[PDB]
Amino acid sequence: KHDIKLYEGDTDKYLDGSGELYVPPSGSVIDDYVRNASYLEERLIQMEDATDQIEVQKNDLEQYRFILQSGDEF
Amino acid sequence: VEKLLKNNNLINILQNIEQMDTCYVCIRLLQELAVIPEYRDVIWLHEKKFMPTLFKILQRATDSQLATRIVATNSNHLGIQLQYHSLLLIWLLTFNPVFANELVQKYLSDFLDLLKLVKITIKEKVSRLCISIILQCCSTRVKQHKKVIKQLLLLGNAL
């Protein structure tokens, strides 16, 4: 969705700058993290489908707006 | 037991939690007595004094990260017992069907916090008891269980 290409870089360690930051020094509560992602994801997939649907209707109608106008005059 | 409860000095010692020693002993004296069914009824009369403090130890544990070690209450043996004792004192009163309905309606904010404890801990002592105390209040036996169930699910995100 984001138009972002795959990120791997493969780090669990806290020593490094990126290590410290993308991986907490706090513990791991497996439930908490799962939840954080599930809810946002539900909104997002619903959102994308809508975007696509709305975009196709707007596009059809914009195209044929002018069509019917021209046709009224002929 | 009723008489000792009414007094100033024993409850004052119990109220303080910033000395581990004081609280630890006091919650245990109360709770040990609660095992025997008859006291549960008198202990509940003086509830409103000790009970916010019992809730304060439990909340205090949720906010301070387990990723560290402090010596006051973390994942070390002293803390583990403090949480346990508080929850055990609670669980005992809640076994009576009326008391449990009454607990939810008064202590609602403080009560919802139990869900949180289960999550942050790995300790099978702290967690079993949190879930259990909720289970008792959600029971068919308890008066107005339909109401309590709505309240828990909706606000507290129980489901």
Name the E strands within chain A: none
- Rounded Cα distance between B97 and B94, Å, is 7
CA distance A47 to A55: 12
B154 vs B156: CA distance, rounded Å: 6
Return the amino acid letter for B106. Answer: K
For A43, what's the count of Cα atoms within 13 Å in the CB-facing half-sphere? Answer: 4
Instruction: Tell which residue, B107, B83, B92, has the closest CA to residue B31.
Output: B92
Alpha carbon of A20: minimum distance to chain B alpha carbons (Å): 14
B122 interaction partners in chain A (CB closer than 8 Å): none
**Resolution rounded to one decimal, in angstroms:** 7.6
The residues, any chain, with a CB within 8 Å of residue B50's CB and separated by 6 or more, are: B11, B14, B15, B30, B89
Please say whether the beta carbons of B131 and B140 come within 8 A: no
CA distance B139 to B133: 10
Contact B65 A26 (CB under 8 A): yes
